[PDB]
Amino acid sequence: GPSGGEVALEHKKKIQKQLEHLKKLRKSGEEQRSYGEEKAVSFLKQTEALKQRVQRKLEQVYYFLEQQEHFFVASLEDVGQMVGQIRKAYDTRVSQDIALLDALIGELEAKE
Amino acid sequence: GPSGGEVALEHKKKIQKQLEHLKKLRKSGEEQRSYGEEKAVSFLKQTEALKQRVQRKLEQVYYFLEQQEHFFVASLEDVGQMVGQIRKAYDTRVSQDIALLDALIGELEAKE
Amino acid sequence: GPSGGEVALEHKKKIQKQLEHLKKLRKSGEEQRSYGEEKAVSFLKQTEALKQRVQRKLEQVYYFLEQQEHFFVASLEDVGQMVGQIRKAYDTRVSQDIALLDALIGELEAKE
Amino acid sequence: GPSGGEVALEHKKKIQKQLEHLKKLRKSGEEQRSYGEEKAVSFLKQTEALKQRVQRKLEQVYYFLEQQEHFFVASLEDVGQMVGQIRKAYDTRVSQDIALLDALIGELEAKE
């Protein structure tokens, strides 16, 4: 037969190997739950950063449109003022032509 | 000699043409002043139109960036929730395995 | 003590519960692997959808900037052609006025 | 009577004062044509400048979108490659745990 000695032996080893596999499995559990955690934390963290990058960009754009809106209205205001001064200057001039034609008019008319 | 009659005639005509060429010039002055004004009025007007068009536009761009900013933060919030629920559901599950491995461990390791 | 029948019994029950726990653990493994796959799949999918949505958007912005740039150059082209017509219409008119003043100039200048 | 002398005198002055007003008016004419020209030239020129400023802007904006589109698709590719690697690493680790239960399974299921 096998003998009481060598039966006890193998069973001891046998239960040893078992309890070894199990405790790994349980280690692997804890690492798995750990990797999951740190990875979820990392994910959320980066994502946050994406959310802020994209925001800070949109701010930069917002303000850029405002400055451009501003510059644009000011250009056209400026145009406004120019058309105004070219009008005025011509008018002053043409009416001085006209006042001087009236001079020439009334005099021929009033003697005649 | 050219006669007193034909002298008087030529002068009369000669002085009429002059008063004619003058009163045109004066008419022509009033028209230039009038055209100048109308056309400054118009120019300003269209310019104003251009001004508002661009604003009302930039307004459309502004609100469009808001909508998209909203949709973007909200997408990423969603991702947030998902990652989270995927961390919880794995955790629960793995921790179940673990406590069930512990059940197996104590047992071997207390008859041992 | 227990008798042959009650040890054989307990051991049978004992090895059964064990195999019952192991095999759940093995089922729970397969579920875990399956869930992690289906969930990587859907996450990638949604991501993709995010990718194309943002793209489809930027496309819409690109072409909007093009149509507006277009309208703007054409607007200013218009301004150009208007300034040019008001310049021409005034020139024609003044040079008439002028050519007629010359009519009157040479007249006196030539008799005197 | 006023004497042939002081009649010749008045007429001389009278005609002088006329050819004087009529030559100013004619100068005033060509100055009007000159002023309107250089001011058409100036107006067109600034306008041209406005035209090109708006373009070089819209050109800066366009390239800015391209770069953001680029950064965005790369971020998400990145996310892609991450999800994949986390999927991979769990998978290895779980099917490993599995095979280990399969070692434990067949053992009982062949001695039994």
Whether the CB-CB separation of A23 and B104 falls below 8 Å is answered with no
In the DSSP assignment, the letter for residue A1 is -
Reported as half-sphere exposure (CB side, CA atoms, 13 A), residue B65 has a value of 17
D32 touches chain C (CB under 8 A): yes
Method: X-ray
The alpha carbon of residue A83 is apart from the nearest alpha carbon of chain D, in Å, by: 9
Rounded Cα distance, B54 and A72, in Å: 9
Rounded Cα distance, C77 and C71, in Å: 10
Amino acid at D25: L
Whether the CB-CB separation of A95 and B33 falls below 8 Å is answered with yes
Structure tokens at C111: 């008799």
In the DSSP assignment, the letter for residue D1 is -
Out of A43, A76, A95, the one facing B33 most closely (by C-beta) is A95
Out of A43, A82, A97, the one facing D25 most closely (by C-beta) is A97
The alpha carbon of residue D8 is apart from the nearest alpha carbon of chain C, in Å, by: 13
Q: B23: which residues sit within 8 A by CB, 6+ positions away? A: A101, A105
Rounded Cα distance, C59 and B36, in Å: 46
What SS3 class is residue C3?
coil
Q: Residues of C with CB below 8 A from B89's CB? A: 35
Rounded Cα distance, C7 and B75, in Å: 62
Q: D51: which residues sit within 8 A by CB, 6+ positions away? A: C73, C76
The experimental resolution of this structure, in angstroms, equals: 2.4
CA D63 to chain centre: 11
- Within 10 angstroms of residue A58's Cβ, the number of other Cβ atoms is 15
Whether the CB-CB separation of A21 and C26 falls below 8 Å is answered with no
3-state secondary structure C17-56: HHHHHHHHHHHHHHHHHHHHHHHHHHHHHHHHHHHHHHHH
Pick the residue of B63, B66, B91, B111 with the most A CBs within 10 A to test the interface with A by mutation: B91
Rounded Cα distance, A26 and B105, in Å: 9
Pick the residue of D30, D71, D95, D111 with the most A CBs within 10 A to test the interface with A by mutation: D71
Whether the CB-CB separation of A33 and B87 falls below 8 Å is answered with no
Cross-chain residue pair D39–A86, CB shorter than 8 Å: yes
Q: C108: which residues sit within 8 A by CB, 6+ positions away? A: D15, D18, D19, D22
Structure tokens at A107: 């005099």
Whether the CB-CB separation of D83 and C40 falls below 8 Å is answered with yes
Rounded Cα distance, B87 and B93, in Å: 10
CA B78 to chain centre: 32
Rounded Cα distance, C35 and C39, in Å: 6
Whether the CB-CB separation of A82 and C83 falls below 8 Å is answered with no
Whether the CB-CB separation of B72 and A108 falls below 8 Å is answered with no
What is the four-CA torsion angle of D35, D41, D44, D48, rounded to 10 degrees? -140
- Within 10 angstroms of residue D25's Cβ, the number of other Cβ atoms is 23
Q: Give pairs for D77-84: CB < 8 Å, separation 24+.
A: D79/C47, D80/C44, D80/C47, D82/A43, D83/C40, D83/C43, D83/C44, D83/C47, D84/C40, D84/C44
Reported as half-sphere exposure (CB side, CA atoms, 13 A), residue B8 has a value of 4
What SS3 class is residue B2?
coil
Whether the CB-CB separation of A19 and B109 falls below 8 Å is answered with yes
Q: Residues of B with CB below 8 A from A43's CB? A: 83
- Residue B72: which of A109, C80, C79, A53 has the closest Cα? A53
| DSSP string computed for B21-37 | HHHHHHHHHHHHHHHHH
Reported as half-sphere exposure (CB side, CA atoms, 13 A), residue B10 has a value of 6
Residue ranges of alpha helices (H) inside chain A are 4-111
Burial of D74 (0-12, 13-18, 19+ CB in 10 A): exposed
Q: In the complex, which subunits touch D with 3 or more CB pairs below 8 angstroms?
A: A, C
What SS3 class is residue D2?
coil
- Within 10 angstroms of residue D9's Cβ, the number of other Cβ atoms is 12
Q: Is the sign of the CA dihedral A34, A40, A43, A44 positive or negative?
A: negative
Rounded Cα distance, C77 and C82, in Å: 9
What is the four-CA torsion angle of D101, D107, D110, D112, rounded to 10 degrees? -100
